[PDB]
């Protein structure tokens, strides 16, 4: 991941105008949809909470725990760290992200701060639900000027997705000042 | 990097008993006694800074500056970003690290952040002299409870250094209370 902490801007987009930190965003999203697709009730919630960090769950499969044969770690932290320009550079430029899978009636959790996990991927619970949830706070130090997720800015990109993945629900929920939608086809 | 960053008391020590906080020095020594012992004049010089950084400096060669042919960035980063335990290691666990290359009559300015480069090394200016400095702040992320350097840790080992370096001026020096030593044994 140090290739990306070099040069977020290649990756991400530009760090100062407010265009990679939306794109961290989208990033996210472009994986929740996938895993959305290939479920039963295909619903996406994308959440902009009040100490500035984003949420994307989807009601999926939930993405795969097992240990990865040649990395030796769960399947779950090679996705979050091996190099769509792929969420590890999302977890890469985030001063934190938490992931919690629910998968085959348990529930995982892991923990990130700037793209290193802080333990392996661990069984918290038992669970009936399915799916993969990613939440994530921008690392201040890449992401300048525009340090602010706007509401607009993310409803018209979910807006255009709603209608290109005509099967799926995407709801949108600001904390901040309680706004919501709900785009589906 | 991210190897060392996963589990940094593998690789530097322990990180809350101020073993390891002290090992980071060491370490950065260590690489200083080795480009001086290539030289004539031989010295190194540790200070330690009011805001709880470390820099070692050497007036030897100077590491290598050029584009490694592989790697497609300068040797000097190779150095500080690959994997005693290696340079690589100190810079992963600084929250900032500070490398001044005085090398072909040029000095060279790179700065780091928890092992990561903020540029390219580059020339900033010339010079008369030779030699290699490390300045690194150690991340307070990784290093908990004993945060602060004690002089008399670093001034006890590079005594004992000092013995088996010959030729080799080390100075010690505490920019806190003005404490400083001079360790300097020419046998042989
Ligand atoms: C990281 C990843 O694969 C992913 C998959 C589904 C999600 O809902 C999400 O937020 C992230
Ligand atoms: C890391 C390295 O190679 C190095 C060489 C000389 C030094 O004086 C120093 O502080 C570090
Ligand atoms: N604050 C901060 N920035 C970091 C970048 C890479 C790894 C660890 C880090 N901690």
Redesign the interface.
Known sequence: ??AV??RPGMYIGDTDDGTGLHHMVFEVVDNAIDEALAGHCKEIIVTIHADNSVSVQDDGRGIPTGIHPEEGVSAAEVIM?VLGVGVSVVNALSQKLELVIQREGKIHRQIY?????QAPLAVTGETEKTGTMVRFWPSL?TFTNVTEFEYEILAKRLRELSFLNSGVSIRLRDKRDGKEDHFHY
Not at 113 to 117: A, I, N, T
Request: glycine share 10%; charged share 45%; aromatic share 0%.
């Open positions: 991941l140090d902490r070099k760290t701060e700037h793209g290193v996990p130090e």
